[PDB]
Design a protein around this nucleic acid. Structure first.
Lengths: 78, 68, 321, 64, 49, 49, 49, 368
RNA sequence: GGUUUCUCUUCAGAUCGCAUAAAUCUUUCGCCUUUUACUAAAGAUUUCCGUGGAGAGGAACAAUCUGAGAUUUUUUGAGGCCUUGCUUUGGCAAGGCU
């Protein structure tokens, strides 16, 4: 469902907000079955701190929120 | 199951307010749920200030409660 | 009537009339008229209703080999009673089983052809015949028609090189290339892929068996293989899908042959037809002429094919009414 | 659980549940994202070959 | 040969596999042998072009 | 005889009128329901092209 | 045509005939051979969707 | 290669522009189609195969023009090659009679024509790299390898312009100054061809003397290129040239019974079998063979007629070979409709081609 | 939440017909004192024997049947607790905590 939609839209640019407050916003390299997924050029903003541009960041289910882009129609995953 | 389908129908027809376990009270259209409560919400204003998120995906460990 | 039942019935009738002329020592021909001009029309109850009919043709069927068709092959309504086969007493649509089509396909071998594709009919097809009539040249084996329509420097002898003759087949196959003024020309089909179908004789051979008539492969640099039994041993309860299922049946090769059976014999369900509406021996003149023929039967082939092309040409889509 | 082949040679920096972030060469990993990272230096000390579990590794990135 | 000259990535699908089965009635070992020989000749042609 | 047995062995449910079909479109429908949509070609032209 | 039957839901091949979606000139239908090459742009899913 | 040549002509000269609009429409819609208008007013179309050209003519007759248009016989096109060298060290000179150019035409080697045509060797290479290519596998002299100037009628065509001139190396700066105009004259001469207006192939043009005045200027401003064209034509005339016929390669999927019938149709159409083999894993046979392109007109149709369509053949243009007849023998009698024998073939081929668009006769001293 | 079958009505645009006839008219012919009857091709229509889909009514047999209907890695306790900024009193913005 949601994991299948993330695997379908796992090439666009999205933001993953972790439970520790680390918000990695960037292109998705690949979404796995679990929440451990690799991203590309993610500007991981730390909790009340600056961002770090990581070309390869792999996530455990610490990544809680996922602000997805508009590359997903209502019947694209329905 | 049927209660989750009714909650998804109420979220599609109205503004459902889901208060997740990350203190995120989101009023808006919850697009889909899951058996592990992997919830995708379409165009929902979430208060952690109700900032609008066009599509938000949350886990069932990080979710707490929902309401119509 | 059901078309494969009717065709196999007439193939049986063909077999016994072959047997009857091959076995009867002295056939007696019949008088015409059978009754005199003073002989009145007789009463049915006084003459025919009180007496028993004599025997029909009616070959004995095999209990072993002709097993599904063994009962009802000689009925006027063979399977009209059976609800699992027909819709009921209207006798409109038939839904059948594979071994009785195999039995009827075996029984109707005399009337049926042996061709497997339209690539035998290279330029002997209806589009080629329409082209031949519309451009008014004909095959010597093909039929002839009326003309449909009733100086050039291209015909200069000092600009034309003649090496091979541009014959009828070339102008038929490429009408825009070869026939100036191509009008009402029907383009033929091109080469379909050729049917190379193995035909089995005995059921002792398997349904997946190397025919020696097929030329051998004689196949002759390593492969990217993983570690052998060092990783990924298969778990419990994994299996091929039909490992419990056996490989083949005796009716499997029968259904393989029934796939390449012709149009009234490669069907499991269909509609019954009128026996006037079924042309039985249409394939016999839709093939070419055989060898050793006199002039009269080849002219017969040409005239039968000529009226067949005329009937195919003058077909119109029917109105509502 | 599937990020071990991408960082089987390159160095990675991951933060444990203690809050310490260690950068080291991941030589091996388990199926539950328990990655044994050789020559791990935590931000300052050295942990050696450290098997950081999947639940412990909240955040991670490719350093080398 | 023209794909070798044009320098494009080529993958091969083997169509009409039912002609080995319904139309040729091959054994599975012989069908594997024919397909492996097909793969070997395509690889040899790629080697020599 | 054993076609619905094979259908349940593959986990496929079909109606009676589909079993009453002629052999070639029924076999096309069986192969379509067995292999689903075309995905190996999509992986073929994404991962290797 | 099989990809069009996958993607387009209402487009199906008939039982008697094999349709030719890319062959759109009438000369291709008359001759029974592909003549002119045809482009199709489509969205395709893999095994991972 | 679009090699099959067909003349085409409208019935109505009033509807002649309409079929010309349709000719631009079919040339627009087809990539390999070639539409030309000759000196006689005829429209010559070059195409790949008979089915392709019948489809093109069907599209022209139905969609792209509504006019019924007459079609001539399908023929092929040829090239021009030579057998022996130019027996005369032949010369021409500029219209201002100062620059005098002397050059001979000789046959090329085996692999050089296909190597230049496949662009195995390039003029875009270094001259030393080209010399190493010509010296390792073709075993040339290094002076003859550095003497090479240009390739054929077009970009990398199969003629080699060798400029090896020891009497004219005393003014090699002037020779390099006129080198470019010599190259366009050579390209134009090999583009036109003085036999029957075909492209010149497999000829090495070796320059012997170049008596050129220093700084031609006024006579160098557009007169060297027709002088070099006259040099190429005149050197081609005594170099005993031949017509060069394309051949077609035929692959036949046939049942094994009618193989002798296929051999009989090959004997009827002068074709010779490369190799017959059975198909691996199939009961049929594959026959690889070669045929003349003139004899290839519907060899597939005749084979399917003889074998009832069971044997199916596909043919392609493969290569070129020489015509065994002589084109320049004026003593050969030619019947206008009877099929000529093999020594009389090339004579008939050059007479009908010269009659097709221009003057029929041929002069060996027309330029020089 | 029956089937078979019969009748009527409506749409027949599919090879309605894996079949094939005839007639009229406009003509070209063949034949040819002339009238039907003619010969074989085209155009223009028609008729007949069939045909498909839908609906209604009737009849006989099923008389229901047929459907639908947890703790132990990452999706549940590392849970609690305090100070400063703000209290906007649900606790929020920062620190040491087990």
């Amino acid at each position: 469902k949601l994991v299948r939609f993330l695997m379908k839209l796992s090439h666009e640019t999205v933001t993953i907000e972790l439970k520790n407050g680390t918000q990695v916003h960037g292109t998705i390299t690949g979404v796995d079955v679990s929440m451990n997924t690799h991203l590309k050029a993610v500007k991981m903003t730390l909790k009340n701190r600056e961002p770090v541009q990581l070309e390869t960041l792999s996530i455990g289910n610490n990544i809680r929120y996922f602000i997805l882009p508009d590359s997903l129609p209502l019947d694209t995953l329905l | 199951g049927p209660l989750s389908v009714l909650t998804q129908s109420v979220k599609n027809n109205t503004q459902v307010l889901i208060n997740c376990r990350n203190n995120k009270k989101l009023l808006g259209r919850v697009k889909a749920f899951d058996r592990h409560c992997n919830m995708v919400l379409e165009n929902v204003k979430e208060m952690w200030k109700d900032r609008y998120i066009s599509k938000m995906f949350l886990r069932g460990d990080s979710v707490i409660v929902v309401l119509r | 009537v059901i078309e494969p039942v009717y065709i196999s019935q007439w193939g049986s009738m063909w077999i016994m009339m072959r047997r009857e002329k091959r076995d009867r020592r002295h056939f007696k021909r019949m008088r015409f008229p059978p009754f005199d001009d003073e002989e009145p029309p007789l009463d049915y109850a006084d003459n025919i209703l009180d007496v028993e009919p004599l025997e029909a043709i009616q070959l004995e069927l095999d209990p072993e080999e002709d097993a599904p068709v063994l009962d009802w092959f000689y009925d006027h309504q063979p399977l009209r009673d059976s609800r699992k086969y027909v819709n009921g007493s209207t006798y409109q649509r038939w839904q059948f089983t594979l071994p009785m089509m195999s039995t009827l396909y075996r029984l109707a071998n005399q009337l049926l052809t042996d061709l497997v594709d339209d690539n035998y009919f290279y330029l002997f097809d209806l589009k080629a015949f329409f082209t031949s009539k519309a451009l008014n040249m004909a095959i010597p084996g093909g039929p002839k028609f009326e003309p449909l329509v009733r100086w050039n420097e291209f015909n200069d002898i000092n600009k034309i090189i003649i090496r091979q003759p541009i014959r009828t087949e070339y102008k038929i196959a490429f009408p825009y290339l070869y026939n100036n003024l191509p009008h009402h020309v029907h383009l033929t089909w091109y080469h379909t892929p050729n049917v190379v179908f193995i035909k089995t004789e005995d059921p002792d051979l398997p349904a997946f068996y190397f025919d020696p008539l097929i030329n051998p492969i004689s196949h002759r640099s390593q492969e990217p293989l993983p570690d052998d039994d060092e990783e990924f041993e298969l778990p419990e309860f994994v299996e091929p899908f039909l490992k419990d299922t056996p490989l083949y049946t005796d009716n499997t090769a029968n259904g393989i042959a029934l796939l390449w059976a012709p149009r009234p014999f490669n069907l499991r369900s269909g509609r019954t037809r009128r026996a006037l509406d079924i042309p039985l021996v249409k394939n016999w003149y839709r093939e070419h002429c055989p060898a050793g023929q006199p002039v009269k039967v080849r002219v017969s082939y040409q005239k039968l094919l000529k009226y067949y092309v005329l009937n195919a040409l003058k077909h119109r889509p029917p109105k509502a009414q | 659980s599937s990020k071990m082949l991408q960082h089987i040679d390159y160095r990675m920096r991951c933060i444990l549940q203690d809050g310490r972030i260690f950068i080291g060469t991941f030589k091996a990993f388990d199926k539950h994202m328990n990655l044994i990272l050789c020559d791990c230096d935590e931000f300052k000390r050295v942990l050696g070959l450290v098997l950081l579990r999947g639940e412990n590794l909240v955040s991670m990135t490719v350093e080398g | 040969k023209h794909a070798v000259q044009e320098r494009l990535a080529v993958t091969v699908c083997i169509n009409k596999i039912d002609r080995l089965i319904l139309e040729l009635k091959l054994p599975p070992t012989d069908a594997y042998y024919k397909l492996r020989h097909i793969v070997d000749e395509v690889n040899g042609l790629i080697s020599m072009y | 005889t054993s076609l619905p047995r094979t259908l349940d062995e593959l986990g496929i449910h079909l109606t009676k009128e589909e079993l009453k079909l002629n052999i070639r479109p029924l076999l096309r429908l069986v192969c379509k329901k067995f292999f689903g949509e075309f995905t190996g070609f999509v992986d073929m032209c994404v991962q290797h092209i | 045509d099989c990809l069009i039957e996958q993607t387009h839901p209402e487009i199906r091949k008939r039982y008697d005939q094999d349709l030719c979606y890319t062959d759109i000139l009438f000369t291709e239908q008359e001759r029974g051979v592909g003549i002119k090459s045809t482009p199709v742009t489509v969205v395709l899913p893999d095994t991972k969707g | 290669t679009s090699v099959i040549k067909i003349a085409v002509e409208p019935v109505n000269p009033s509807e002649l522009p309409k079929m010309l609009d349709g000719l631009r429409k079919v040339n627009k819609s087809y990539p390999s189609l070639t539409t030309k208008v000759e000196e006689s007013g005829e429209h010559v179309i070059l195409g790949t195969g008979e089915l392709y050209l019948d489809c093109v003519m069907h599209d022209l007759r139905k969609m792209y023009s509504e006019i019924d248009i007459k079609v001539a016989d399908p023929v092929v096109t040829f090239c021009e090659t030579v057998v022996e060298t130019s027996s005369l060290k032949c010369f021409a000179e500029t219209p201002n009679k100062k620059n005098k150019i002397t050059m001979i035409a000789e046959p090329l080697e085996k692999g050089l024509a296909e190597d230049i045509e496949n662009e195995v060797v390039q003029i875009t290479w270094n001259r030393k790299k080209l010399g190493e290519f010509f010296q390792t596998k073709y075993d040339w002299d290094l002076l003859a390898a550095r003497s090479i100037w240009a390739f054929g009628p077009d970009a990398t065509g199969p003629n080699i312009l060798v400029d090896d001139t020891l009497p004219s190396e005393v003014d090699k700066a002037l020779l390099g100054s006129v080198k470019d105009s010599i190259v366009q004259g050579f390209q134009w001469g090999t583009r036109e061809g003085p036999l029957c207006d075909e492209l010149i192939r497999n000829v090495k043009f070796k320059i012997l003397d170049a008596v050129v005045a220093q700084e031609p200027l006024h006579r160098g401003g557009g007169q060297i290129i027709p002088t070099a064209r006259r040099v190429v034509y005149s050197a081609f005339l005594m170099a005993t040239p031949r017509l060069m016929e394309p051949y077609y390669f035929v692959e036949v999927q046939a049942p094994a019974d009618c193989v002798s019938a296929v051999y009989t149709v090959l004997a009827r159409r002068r074709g010779h079998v490369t190799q017959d083999a059975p198909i691996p894993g199939s009961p049929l046979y594959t026959i690889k063979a070669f045929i003349p392109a003139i004899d290839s007109f519907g060899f597939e149709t005749d084979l399917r007629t003889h074998t009832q369509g069971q044997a199916f053949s596909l043919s392609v243009f493969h290569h070129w070979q020489i015509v065994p007849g002589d084109p320049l023998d004026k003593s050969i009698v030619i019947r206008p409709l009877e099929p000529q024998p093999a020594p009389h073939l090339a004579r008939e081929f050059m007479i009908k081609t010269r009659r097709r668009k221009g003057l029929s006769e041929d002069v060996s001293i027309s330029k020089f």
